């Protein structure tokens, strides 16, 4: 049981997805920061929810939000700056989080 949560899952890490943000600032402004965010990202099995959309949408918003809550007993802050690259960041791995999930799934399937 993952805390409280209502059934979430959290796997393992995997390195920075380096986002094309190249706007202003959220060009070199991810760059230099992007070591003070998450490496993983907090999701679901598909064996009952087998879906895109809620693995990057609710995916996304429940580890944002659990990189403000958690961290906030340490006494945390971000600004809105830092949670919008965080959760494009999040994006990209909560895509990736579900394709971890869908091959181990596709092969108990076919082929």
């Known amino acids: 049981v993952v805390g409280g949560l209502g059934g979430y899952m959290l796997g393992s890490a995997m390195s ?3 986002i094309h ?3 202003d600032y959220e060009d070199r402004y991810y760059r230099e920061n992007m070591y003070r965010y998450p490496n993983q990202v907090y999701y679901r099995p598909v064996d009952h929810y087998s879906n895109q959309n809620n693995f990057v949408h609710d995916c996304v918003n429940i580890t944002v939000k659990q990189h403000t809550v958690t961290t906030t007993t340490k006494g945390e802050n971000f600004t809105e700056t830092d949670i919008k690259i965080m959760e494009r ?4 791995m909560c895509i990736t989080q579900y394709q971890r999930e869908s091959q ?6 076919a082929s």
Do not use: H, S
Not at 89 to 92: P, R
Not at 104 to 109: E, L, T, V
């Open 104 to 109: 181990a799934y596709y092969q108990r399937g």
């Open 89 to 92: 960041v999040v994006e990209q």
């Open 16 to 18: 920075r997805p380096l």
């Open 21 to 23: 943000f190249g706007n």
